[PDB]
Amino acid sequence: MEENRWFLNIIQDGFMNGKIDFDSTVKLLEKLHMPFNLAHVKHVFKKTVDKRKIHTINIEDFRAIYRAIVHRNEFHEIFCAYSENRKNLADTELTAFLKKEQFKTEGAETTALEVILKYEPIDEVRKRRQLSFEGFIRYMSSEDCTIFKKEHRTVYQDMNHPLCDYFISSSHNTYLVSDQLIGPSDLNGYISALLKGCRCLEIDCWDGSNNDPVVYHGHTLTSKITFCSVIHVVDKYAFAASDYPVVLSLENHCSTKQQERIAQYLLNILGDKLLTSPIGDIEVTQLPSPEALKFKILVKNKKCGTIEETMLRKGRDSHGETGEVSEEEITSKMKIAMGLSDLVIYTKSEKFVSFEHSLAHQKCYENNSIGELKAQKFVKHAANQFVSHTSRFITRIYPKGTRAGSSNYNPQEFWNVGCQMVALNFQTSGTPMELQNGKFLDNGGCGYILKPEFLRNRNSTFNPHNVGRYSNPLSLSIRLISGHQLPPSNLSKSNKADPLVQLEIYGVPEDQAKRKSSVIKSNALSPRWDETFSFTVQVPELALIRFCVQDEISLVANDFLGQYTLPLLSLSKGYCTVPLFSKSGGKLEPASLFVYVWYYAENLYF
Numbered sequence: 199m200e201e202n203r204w205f206l207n208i209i210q211d212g213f214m215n216g217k218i219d220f221d222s223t224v225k226l227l228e229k230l231h232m233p234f235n236l237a238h239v240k241h242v243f244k245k246t247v248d249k250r251k252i253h254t255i256n257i258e259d260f261r262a263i264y265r266a267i268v269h270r271n272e273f274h275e276i277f278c279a280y281s282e283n284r285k286n287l288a289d290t291e292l293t294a295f296l297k298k299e300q301f302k303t304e305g306a307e308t309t310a311l312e313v314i315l316k317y318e319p320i321d322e323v324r325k326r327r328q329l330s331f332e333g334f335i336r337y338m339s340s341e342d343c344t345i346f347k348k349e350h351r352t353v354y355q356d357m358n359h360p361l362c363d364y365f366i367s368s369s370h371n372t373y374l375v376s377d378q379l380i381g382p383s384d385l386n387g388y389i390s391a392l393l394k395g396c397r398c399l400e401i402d403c404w405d406g407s408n409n410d411p412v413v414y415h416g417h418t419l420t421s422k423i424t425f426c427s428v429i430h431v432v433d434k435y436a437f438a439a440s441d442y443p444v445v446l447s448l449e450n451h452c453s454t455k456q457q458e459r460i461a462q463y464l465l466n467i468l469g470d471k472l473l474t475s476p477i478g479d480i481e482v483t484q485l486p487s488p489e490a491l492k493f494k495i496l497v498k499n500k501k502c503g504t505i506e507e508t509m510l511r512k513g514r515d516s517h518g519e520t521g522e523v524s525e526e527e528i529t530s531k532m533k534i535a536m537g538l539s540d541l542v543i544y545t546k547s548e549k550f551v552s553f554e555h556s557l558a559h560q561k562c563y564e565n566n567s568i569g570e571l572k573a574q575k576f577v578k579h580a581a582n583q584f585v586s587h588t589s590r591f592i593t594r595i596y597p598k599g600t601r602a603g604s605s606n607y608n609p610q611e612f613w614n615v616g617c618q619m620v621a622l623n624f625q626t627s628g629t630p631m632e633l634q635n636g637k638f639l640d641n642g643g644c645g646y647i648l649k650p651e652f653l654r655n656r657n658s659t660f661n662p663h664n665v666g667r668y669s670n671p672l673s674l675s676i677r678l679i680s681g682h683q684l685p686p687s688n689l690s691k692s693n694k695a696d697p698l699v700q701l702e703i704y705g706v707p708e709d710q711a712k713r714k715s716s717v718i719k720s721n722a723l724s725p726r727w728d729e730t731f732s733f734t735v736q737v738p739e740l741a742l743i744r745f746c747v748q749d750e751i752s753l754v755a756n757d758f759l760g761q762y763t764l765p766l767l768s769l770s771k772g773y774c775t776v777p778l779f780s781k782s783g784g785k786l787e788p789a790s791l792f793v794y795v796w797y798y799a800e801n802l803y804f
């Protein structure tokens with residue numbers, strides 16, 4: 199009666215010209231501010247008017263449509279359990295639910311009040327400090343109840359360790375927005391990457407006409423953009439999504455005259471953002487922290503000579519001075535303008551020879567770039583030497599040169615041995631970028647994640663192929679309860695799919711796992727599984743968990759409906775929702791799963 203008056207109050211405006219068609223039904227549902235899938239609404243509307251002359255609906259029809267799309271049985275069961283089948287939850291009943299079923303302890307009497315004030319739409323009920331079913335569905339569908347832990351949505355990790363101690367969000371050939379051979383270069387590559395909190399961007403520099411450097415993929419048909427315009431974009435967007443330092447990975451193919459223009463543009467456009475001298479003493483023996491370098495941009499490039507020479511050359515104009523460096527950097531001796539060489543302080547790109555050579559001779563401010571194929575050989579045959587390397591030196595992996603369509607390797611292979619800059623083609627849809635985007639949700643999306651302790655100890659014996667005494671076993675149980683408004687199959691003429699859910703663990707080889715639910719026939723709107731999945735994970739700090747929702751098409755084919763990936767240790771506990779993303783990386787809202795999550799680590803217990 200209260201609920202009904204609230205509801206009529208919102209929608210009745212819509213019926214002022216009598217019964218409404220489909221386009222008006224849609225416009226009216228939006229007034230209730232719950233997201234809906236058009237195909238689902240279209241279906242329930244067609245079933246409502248199927249055997250009728252006019253294909254219009256009245257107010258009672260519209261209520262039934264709303265109830266079918268928005269109300270969820272799985273939420274009703276829970277609500278009636280805490281309400282004792284009353285119409286509303288008392289504030290003490292809601293408190294009970296928050297503490298016992300979502301483990302939202304410490305300030306639960308507090309959070310109950312806040313849930314009501316934030317989500318209860320019926321003014322009457324809100325004033326009695328109660329929650330209606332309408333308010334409960336809004337709360338349970340909100341960002342307060344998603345599976346990613348609220349505490350991980352801010353920068354919570356220790357940001358005061360040396361730079362080498364972090365995983366760093368890293369993009370390959372950032373200027374490309376499609377393939378590697380014939381598609382465009384575009385400033386949007388840089389804008390998009392930076393807005394996702396990417397910290398290490400690649401710029402391939404080539405000589406332009408008019409003596410002005412340009413950016414494109416050398417020896418291809420990709421279009422060109424000006425170097426100048428890339429630096430203007432970096433100036434505007436570097437710190438849009440994160441406070442933490444950006445690295446510009448320059449792959450230089452310019453003549454020395456155009457290299458001087460590179461240096462000038464960097465200096466003049468970026469100003470005080472650009473790091474142009476050591477923070478401390480000039481004899482650098484460990485890298486500064488991300489915290490020490492907030493709001494700075496660092497140049498990664500080849501360098502001729504010492505930092506000491508750089509500090510001396512600052513007393514004069516260095517125009518016309520050139521060095522020699524050990525290679526031209528290309529995807530698997532050259533002249534350098536010293537004006538450009540002199541912008542390199544903590545991020546000197548150094549040719550890789552061997553792990554032994556690096557141990558003997560490389561400095562902490564020297565990084566290495568290793569192609570996919572070589573790095574995979576080292577992971578397979580020398581994983582602990584690789585860990586020893588990455589604990590000391592910033593290491594960048596990039597995709598092999600034959601990936602001319604911008605496909606990506608699996609990045610988890612390299613994170614498993616502590617590689618800091620695992621560079622991906624950010625533009626390309628696929629599981630690699632889903633793992634990347636999931637991983638770098640953590641630590642507030644700032645693009646730096648502190649590596650586990652066993653990858654930072656310079657004398658670690660960690661081997662991902664045989665974890666042994668580094669194991670920290672975690673037991674995980676996930677109840678898959680339901681799905682809601684899943685995207686219909688591309689083949690359904692109405693609103694059907696045959697959904698199943700695959701749960702995946704990515705991590706060290708012994709932890710990798712796949713589980714599938716049963717297939718539900720012909721129900722995308724409200725499939726109910728109630729199925730329990732169990733895992734043990736030996737190295738939870740490196741693990742990512744992915745929910746992959748598929749449509750069983752035929753005996754030999756499943757289609758992708760949506761997915762979500764996050765770090766295993768960022769899982770919320772108790773009842774929560776899994777938001778889903780399309781292959782393009784678009785939000786499929788309202789498509790969701792409803793689960794109950796519990797896990798514990800063996801290390802808590804004597």
Ligand SMILES: [Ca+2]
Binds near residue numbers: 402
């Ligand atoms: Ca490149």
Ligand SMILES: [Cl-]
Binds near residue numbers: 600601602605
């Ligand atoms: Cl490819």
Ligand SMILES: [Cl-]
Binds near residue numbers: 626627628630
């Ligand atoms: Cl891919």
Ligand code: NA
Binds near residue numbers: 383384386423
């Ligand atoms: Na552009």
